[PDB]
Amino acid sequence: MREVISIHIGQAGVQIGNACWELYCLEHGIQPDGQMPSDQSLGGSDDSFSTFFSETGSGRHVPRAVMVDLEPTVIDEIRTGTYRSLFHPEQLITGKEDAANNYARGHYTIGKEIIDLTLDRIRRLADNCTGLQGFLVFHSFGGGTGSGFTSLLMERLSVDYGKKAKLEFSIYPAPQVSTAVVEPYNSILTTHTTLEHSDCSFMVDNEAIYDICRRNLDIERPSYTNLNRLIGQIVSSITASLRFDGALNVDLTEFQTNLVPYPRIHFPLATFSPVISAEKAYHEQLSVAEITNMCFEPHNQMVKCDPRHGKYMAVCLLFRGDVVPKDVNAAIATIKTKRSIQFVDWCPTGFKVGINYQPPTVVPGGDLAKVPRAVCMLSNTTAIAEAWARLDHKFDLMYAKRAFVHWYVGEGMEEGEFSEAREDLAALEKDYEEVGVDS
Amino acid sequence: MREVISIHIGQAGVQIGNACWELYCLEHGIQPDGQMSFSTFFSETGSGRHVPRAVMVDLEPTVIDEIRTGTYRSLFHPEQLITGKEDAANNYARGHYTIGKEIIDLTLDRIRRLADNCTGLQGFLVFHSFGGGTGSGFTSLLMERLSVDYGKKAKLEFSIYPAPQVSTAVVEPYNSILTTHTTLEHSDCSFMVDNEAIYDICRRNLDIERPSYTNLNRLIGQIVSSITASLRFDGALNVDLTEFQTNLVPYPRIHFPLATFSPVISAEKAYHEQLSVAEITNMCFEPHNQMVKCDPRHGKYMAVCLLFRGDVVPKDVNAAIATIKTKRSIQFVDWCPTGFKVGINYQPPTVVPGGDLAKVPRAVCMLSNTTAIAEAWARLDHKFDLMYAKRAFVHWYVGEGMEEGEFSEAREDLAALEKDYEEVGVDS
Amino acid sequence: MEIAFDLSTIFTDNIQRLTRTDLLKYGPKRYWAVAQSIDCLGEMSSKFHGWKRVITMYDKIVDHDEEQTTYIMWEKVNGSKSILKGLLRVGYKTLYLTDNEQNQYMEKAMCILDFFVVPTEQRSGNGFKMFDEMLKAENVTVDQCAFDKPSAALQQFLEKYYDRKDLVWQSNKYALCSNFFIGRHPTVP
Amino acid sequence: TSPIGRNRPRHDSVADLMRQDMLAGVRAEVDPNSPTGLKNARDFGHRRIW
Amino acid sequence: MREIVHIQAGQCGNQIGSKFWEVISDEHGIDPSGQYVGDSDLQLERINVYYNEAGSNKYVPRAVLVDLEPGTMDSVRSGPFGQLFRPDNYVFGQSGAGNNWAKGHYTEGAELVDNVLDVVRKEAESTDCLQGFQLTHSLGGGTGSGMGTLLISKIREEYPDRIMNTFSVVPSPKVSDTVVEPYNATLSVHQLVENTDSTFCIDNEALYDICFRTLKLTTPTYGDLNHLVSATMSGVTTCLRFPGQLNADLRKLAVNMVPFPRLHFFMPGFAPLTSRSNQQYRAITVPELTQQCFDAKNMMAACDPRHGRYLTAAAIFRGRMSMKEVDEQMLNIQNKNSSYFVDWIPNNVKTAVCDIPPRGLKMSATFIGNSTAIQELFKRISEQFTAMFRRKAFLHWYTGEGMDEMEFTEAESNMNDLVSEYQQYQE
Amino acid sequence: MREIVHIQAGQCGNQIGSKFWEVISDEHGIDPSGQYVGDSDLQLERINVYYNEAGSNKYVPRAVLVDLEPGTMDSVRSGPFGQLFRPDNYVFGQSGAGNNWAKGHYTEGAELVDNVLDVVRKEAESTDCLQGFQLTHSLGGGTGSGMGTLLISKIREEYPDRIMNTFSVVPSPKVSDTVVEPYNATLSVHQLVENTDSTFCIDNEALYDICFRTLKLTTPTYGDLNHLVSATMSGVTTCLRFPGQLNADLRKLAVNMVPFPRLHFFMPGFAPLTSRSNQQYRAITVPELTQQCFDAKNMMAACDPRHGRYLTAAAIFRGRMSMKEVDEQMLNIQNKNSSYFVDWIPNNVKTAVCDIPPRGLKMSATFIGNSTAIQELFKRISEQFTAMFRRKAFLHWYTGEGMDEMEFTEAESNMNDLVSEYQQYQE
């Protein structure tokens, strides 16, 4: 039984998890109140819904999720919302004061008060599951809770479980669109925990998805709900292989083996290619070749970076729906023939292809058109070093004058931790620079 | 075929009886007016009414008047609702020698009339409270008369034990010490219950901030229904009252089991919990789940009775018992290699509308005879010694026919019982 | 397949409607035949369909939170012997439905939870009689019912006796007919 | 309401296990549109070539 | 000509007997209403062994149902085969023994054994030539154990020379569900050793292990265990009711199996036990049945035969099979497992082949092993008995019924001799 | 008399094995439920080569299905011929090897190799006279490429004299879909060289090219490729199951085609492969079958035989035919293509003519080719391995399971040694 525990931390993580679990409930035929009306589905595809949802004696299904936040506004919004009766009441963990957009508050001060309860709930979830595949961590780099509490929790998870896969999806700060004034500090500090205790960290930018929504979905004023829906589509595409059967499956271990060359090079990009409005899908064939070609366009990446200035190392194409492997082979052939898409010389084959026979599930009220096939390209490219460089430059400008250091040193953090994290991210940038040099 | 008589004495016993009979009416489908297996608790009249086999006796007529004016006006037999003129006023002597004698004859006549109407009488169910005056003295007198009259018939009495700290009367230790003598010589199986422990259960498991007496009485009624379900619901591994006593009571004086109901959980949390047999069996043995304010870990178990209900499979029970016996904290006496008496039933517990309990698919009532109950008697010994070193209210007792030597005799008897538990809890 | 009781002395018709109240009245203690027949039919359906568990049980039906009804087809064999022909368990449920053009609906619809015929007793028009008896019993048409993961065979059977094909599959693994004339959509497409 | 009898304790699974002649050995067909159906048709099924 | 009287005592015995009668009626084609709905003339050839003739093509079992509690008796009456038994054979008391051997033997069973014998004698003297009696009970209970031993003594006094069989369920610590069951078991073994011709020890833990490992039953019930015991019972007495290439009745088995008068405790078994998945992919042949009968995991007793030496063995095959194959299989078993067989007995296995297989089965084999490993169950029971008797743990209940403490000492000492005697012939 | 034990490892191996058993059951008239429904007595005469029996006209394949991922086991069981295999033969672990040779060869598959060897042995001594083993796996994965080689080494240790045939799907750059597959292929080639009697190298790109240009398949899925591979499987071993004028078993082919111990890497093929359009436009005679077998387009390995002279060739014909035609066709192929065959070997082609063609085909021929062009696939694999290992691209995943870089260098050196050995006989 292939089954995975998902953790949603902070406001961004919890709000993303709302859309993710809505998508999971839609995919597995589970009502928002936890009931599964399809009586035959319980006796049929047992391994399908067992990945994300548990089961009780009354027939209800409880998601294997722990949503934790240091302030109870968003969690209470869940408890008063449509899915109030879906999640286990003890799996929604709250504090009373947030981290106040501070890494130190979320890590030491307010973190340590409920880190024990969060670990207890996670351990209770893990004991119930028999085939734990890994962990899905949702948080935000620039937040206080989603940075500090995530840093505090990832190390404890690593020292408790260990060999389990810790795949974390995070909202990386955008180069220009920033909703916080001290988010470079939080992101620099959480770089340490996302580099060591994580296994495959997926970065996401808000501006990149805003541009994707504008260009493809033809919406000029989008919001957080659309971004969360797209990230939920990405995570569902990633985890489709565990819960559904298809030719050429790719599980988490295969994913990490193929896409992570070196221990520190585990920061892939992310792009759900067939994103298009309903008014445009009628005029498109949406074949394998074109949805594979849209993957490598810089306008489709969900990190505000230019892949042309770098070199791809490993690419994981997770197709789903009506897909035959010969079309995929032709698609990689055409991509390799392209001179603009430059790979490294030490990776003769850099495409790890996974195919699933379950087509993407369309959420009612969403802006995503119904498509026969979909692909979730997930590349380990060196172009993310430029986003790291932008963040490092912002941090250097903020830290030159010691702009907000007192806020961090007044909550148990030492002033040298900023320098340590800065040096760590500089070392990561140097590693990404020295991995791309031709041999 | 298998009939049992239930007697409720005092305010606490009578209100617990109200809860119990509401639960039984819900279980058997009997309407509150008596109109409609049931032969255990109810006697069917020729016209179709079902009347409980219960005698409600209390010197104070207030609560019985509440019954006679409430929803269950038509349920009980009017002559079975026995009242006096004035209560014992928290006085053991008043309820034993002074006011108890006024209606002891009528109570015994009603009990005899009930017993003669049933051919398969199994035992008695006496509900009362130690701390009261009626429920202590009158229960002592009535139960001694019942032991004289019947004898071999089982006498299973459910008592509300005084809490270690929570109290509603200043003379509770005196009455409890006085009734310790009678509850040890006449009763065949005495289940003492603590109000404070049920308050803790309602606060923690059920997440109730301000529980009332209704909730406590509902849990006690659930316990009694679980105990007596083997006599009226068919299931594998039936446990008779005599079988219950034989398996649970090792020595003539060691007949004070605990009581608990593990699948007590809030309604919202019930739908998100598996509530498997192993889980409920594990949480039966939780120290904070017992309904007496004592720590079972300090004492050593001597005999445990597990009365499972609902959807239960014997293999799951055996696996749960093996897991329990593997645990080091759950310690049994060496001279009881097989400490578990397992009973299963096919009838799941019924849910009272407006109650704090949810509709669990399976339930279990763990009834442990353990030495850890001696802590409560030690607490009452300390209270009685403090209150008797100066003779705070002994004059109220000696002015109602009771003699000064009764207090010393009762204290010696309870000390001897505590010593018996101390000397039986040791290993061979 | 075969039950060792004369079901004619209990059941009034060859296809008897067994609601939850009927099953509670016909307890296994004194009416073991009906409960054993229901459990046997459910086990046979689960074994045929390859399911790892039985979804149609008398105990599971009686203790369910919401009322359900069961249809059993039998025939006379001997003085104390009867043969079981098919199973049909249905009930009313609330469904979160989504029609064409992503229109969101939330209406009470009747579900066909289980509909099975013994493999050696299939064909010969079996099952159609039970389904018609059900529809006449509670005046429900196919236009207002729901199918739980319609099998290829039910997809054809309904195609070849109600001509109702090209069904739409809801997100809850339910397939309904294209007749969404119920209206009052909670959410605009 | 009324007490409810249970039929699960009466089940005799061994009776069907002894009768080997009573084994069916017939499985239902998978849904072609289901992902298992596509897998069966493509990875395990093949098109006639001669 | 070889009629058998069947008596069921207690809930365990009553349920096992009900399952046994259902199995037998299936074998002989007896309609649950009591009619004959068979399809062969061999079923009616020797139907008189277990059933009486009611005239109008109705066959009432020769069974006496006894219990001190009417609840189990009513449950039997309300079952699928409730109408099979004659109503006058139902012998129910007022209240159960309450897991008390003294209650079930000295008082409550004492004022009921008279009514029990008044119908046991009626069934016995209504037969052409009685072959013996068979009892089903549980040693751990009060009613079953105590009343079964009392009735055993009464019948043995009344019928000294007939064969007295008992199918007694032996308690084990692994599936214990009673606090005072070792007392009842120790008190029962005293009478079982002295007043029985063959006692087939059966254990619930072994039946659970079989149903979990071999049959791979996810959720076993008492129906499954009773069906296994019923299949063993039907296999034991199958040469009486059907023709065979090598017949062996109860007395033949007793002569060939017991070396000494009190060594009559056996481990039963069944050969064709196969899982649902492996039913089609397994070839049911004589060799396979042989190694499954002699497999340690297939024994219906907790004790492992590899911890002792076999005194005698008996495998009763059912179905058409060559005698050469059976003989060579037994020779192979003797040679391979020579360390587990006593060397002072030249040949240990008493084989028997029956022509009629069980319904739905191509061939079958019922195993009966007389091994010194049986002493393990009694050693465990004696350990528990001594542990509780060192402190007089629950003896006031037994002394209240008139039985004195001296009886417990005699029962333990006498049962300790039984353990030593099996250990005497174990090397 | 000459039984064959079949082993399936990995997803590709399991799917190819399912297709192979489907084709064999088609040839032997075996119902997908295991029953025999063949219309000819020839099919059942030597069904023991590939099938055991369960008595009631039911045959179970002598196949061992293994995969560390239980999902593939469930997919196989749910296939069209899923219930044909014995449930005990399914051996699975907890999770897949994750495309890691180190995992499957040292920890994850090494835990399960003991159970795999146990079941393989239980099948092996169940045979009257075992001939050898045949294994289906993929060299580009973790489970197949690693654990199958470990099992190959263990089997060769246990049975040094029995034949060992492997049908390995070697990776190719054109249709590559795994990043770390060069490492697995290079590590597996050493074991394949050391512990195999005849390796039939199969390539996905070659199969796709065949399906696209010969059969003119518009959408060739994995089923078509598996069917072609399975047709080769059935053609190779046809003389062990049916009579013919000139019979050649696996030992005969190994003797003919292996001049030196390490040169046992072959190229499969199939004669009657033709498009649906040209079914009636072509006559399936011996010259046409010979030409298409020796054509470079029809061969199932990506390497071009035109760049390498054949060492030995083996065309195993089927169906009724004349052996004058066959001999003269082989002589014509030898003569007209004298530059494509080694001169120091006077005769390179070995022929075998079974008398039973595949169902639906009048006559068929399976080509096996020990050409020197095999060095091309390993040249490409070694190029990819060197490019990746120059910078240790993904070496930490392998070193985290206990592997070493010296192991990688040794494997690369030995694989280049095999390439040089094949090149030595070129000119």
Ligand SMILES: Nc1nc2c(ncn2[C@@H]2O[C@H](COP(=O)(O)CP(=O)(O)OP(=O)(O)O)[C@@H](O)[C@H]2O)c(=O)[nH]1
């Ligand atoms: N194999 C079986 N064991 C059973 C069955 N019913 C009970 N038992 C076991 O029997 C043991 C206790 O035996 P009983 O319940 O018969 C006690 P008994 O009725 O003989 O005496 P009383 O309790 O005095 O009525 C204990 O191991 C039960 O788990 C059954 O149907 N099959």
Ligand SMILES: Nc1nc2c(ncn2[C@@H]2O[C@H](COP(=O)(O)OP(=O)(O)OP(=O)(O)O)[C@@H](O)[C@H]2O)c(=O)[nH]1
């Ligand atoms: N995509 C997406 N991003 C979000 C969402 N909510 C917040 N963010 C981003 O999250 C970043 C960090 O802010 P928060 O996530 O609120 O921080 P936090 O983790 O809640 O920490 P505290 O401020 O201490 O509560 C901001 O820059 C937002 O742009 C959301 O629902 N979706």
